[PDB]
């Protein structure tokens, strides 16, 4: 999961 930022 690529973090939101």
């Amino acid at each position: 999961y690529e973090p939101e930022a």
């Epitope: 690529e2 973090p3 939101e4 930022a5």
Partner: antibody, heavy 122, light 113 residues
Framework: QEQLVESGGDLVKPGASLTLTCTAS?????????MCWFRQAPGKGPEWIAC????????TYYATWAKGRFTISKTSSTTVTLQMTSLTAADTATYFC??????????????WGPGTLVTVSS | QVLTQTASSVSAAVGGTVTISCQSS????????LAWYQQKPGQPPNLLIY???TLASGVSSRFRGSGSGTQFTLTISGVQCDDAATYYC?????????????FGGGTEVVVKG
């Protein structure tokens, strides 16, 4: 221990192309961060160009002005490239590679290279 | 996004205080994804503060970050000649909806010795 080094910066003709490499030492691309490029023209401040997610995504992100002529890629577990095309004098700058830590870890993962200088000249 | 800083230059005598302002065109990520960097010629940005107000490791406590959302301040108390430098704010936003990061244009500190 953990470091980044940019390479590939050189004298290059207007209209030509150049590829820069950001090489990691002390770690390999895992996740929870992005590898990004900035540039800084003489007597100006640094400006964002692009980021690539280190994780499996490999999501790429570009400043509006950049998405034409710039391509950010992962080329190995320790290298990220910036390919730059149709260069003009406006592109003369020090190019820096940066590790962007996910929120919560920005300070922890913050890492910069010393920069590579690109000189667009006839 | 666009980040706008104080002005190009500010000054203070050894021991005095400098204030550097940074405004973001839109709220940074979760209101506190804002960093302060120092830069001297020939070197990469050197992180001072992250998460708007947290001192990076080994950085002197006379650097203070404040603010939230779109408005931020760096305060340098007890200015020393070694603080002569350019200072940049950098905001963070979600890559998938805006620029991953955005630097302000820089504020130079001139220290009067």
């Amino acid at each position: 221990q953990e470091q980044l080094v940019e390479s590939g910066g050189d004298l290059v003709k207007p209209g030509a192309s150049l590829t820069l490499t950001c090489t990691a030492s002390g770690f390999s691309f895992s996740s929870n961060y992005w590898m990004c490029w900035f540039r800084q023209a003489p007597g100006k401040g640094p400006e964002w160009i692009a980021c690539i997610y280190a994780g499996n995504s490999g999501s790429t992100y570009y400043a509006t002005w950049a998405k034409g002529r710039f391509t950010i890629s992962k080329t190995s577990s320790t290298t990220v490239t910036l390919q730059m095309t149709s260069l003009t004098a406006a592109d003369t700058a020090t190019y820096f590679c940066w590790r962007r830590g996910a929120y919560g870890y920005y300070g922890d993962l913050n890492l910069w290279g010393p920069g590579t200088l690109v000189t667009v000249s006839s | 996004q666009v980040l706008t800083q104080t002005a190009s230059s500010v000054s203070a005598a050894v021991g005095g205080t400098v204030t550097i302002s940074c405004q973001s065109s839109q709220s940074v990520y979760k209101n506190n994804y804002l960093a302060w960097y120092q830069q001297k010629p020939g070197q990469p940005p050197n992180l001072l503060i992250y998460n708007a107000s947290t001192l990076a490791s080994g950085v002197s406590s006379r650097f203070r970050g404040s603010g939230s959302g779109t408005q931020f301040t760096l305060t340098i108390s007890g200015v020393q000649c070694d603080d002569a430098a350019t200072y940049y704010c950098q905001g963070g936003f979600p890559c998938r909806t805006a620029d991953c990061n955005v630097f302000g244009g820089g504020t130079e500190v001139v220290v009067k010795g």
